[PDB]
């Protein structure tokens, strides 16, 4: 016997809910930096 | 949503108030009509 588990990838036309994690780095201050706060990119 | 105290009857209160967001649910379904629960 050999148990098999298969994970199914399905992407329907609707907003997504569960997906890969995004790493939030350290918060630096008093320096010129290119930042990104929950998708908001700026310098 | 927004809540406010009132001491009035049979009439919409006169005033200004803003409705803050409460929860965002992206179900992604179509809707055409509704009805409350009571």
UniProtKB/Swiss-Prot annotation, chain A:
- Please give the superkingdom of this protein's source: Viruses
Subunit relationships: Binds to host ACE2. RBD also interacts with the N-linked glycan on 'Asn-90' of ACE2. Cleavage of S generates a polybasic C-terminal sequence on S1 that binds to host Neuropilin-1 (NRP1) and Neuropilin-2 (NRP2) receptors. Interacts with host integrin alpha-5/beta-1 (ITGA5:ITGB1) and with ACE2 in complex with integrin alpha-5/beta-1 (ITGA5:ITGB1). May interact via cytoplasmic c-terminus with M protein. May interact (via N-terminus) with host bilirubin and biliverdin, thereby preventing antibody binding to the SARS-CoV-2 spike NTD via an allosteric mechanism.
Q: What does this protein do?
A: Attaches the virion to the cell membrane by interacting with host receptor, initiating the infection. The major receptor is host ACE2. When S2/S2' has been cleaved, binding to the receptor triggers direct fusion at the cell membrane. When S2/S2' has not been cleaved, binding to the receptor results in internalization of the virus by endocytosis using host TFRC and GRM2 and leading to fusion of the virion membrane with the host endosomal membrane. Alternatively, may use NRP1/NRP2 and integrin as entry receptors.
Give the shown range, full length included.
507 to 549 of 1273
- What is the organism field in this record? Severe acute respiratory syndrome coronavirus 2 (2019-nCoV)
List the protein's name.
Spike protein S1
**Disordered: where is this region?**
13-35
Supply the source organism's classification.
Viruses, Riboviria, Orthornavirae, Pisuviricota, Pisoniviricetes
């Amino acid at each position: 016997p050999y148990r098999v588990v298969v994970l199914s990838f399905e992407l329907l036309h609707a907003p997504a809910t569960v997906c890969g994690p995004k790493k939030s780095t350290n918060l630096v201050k008093n320096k010129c930096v290119n930042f990104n706060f929950n998708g908001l990119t700026g310098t | 949503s927004k809540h406010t105290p009132i001491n009035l009857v049979r009439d919409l209160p006169q005033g200004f108030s803003a409705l803050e967001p409460l929860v965002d649910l992206p179900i992604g379904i179509n809707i055409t009509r509704f009805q409350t629960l009571l």
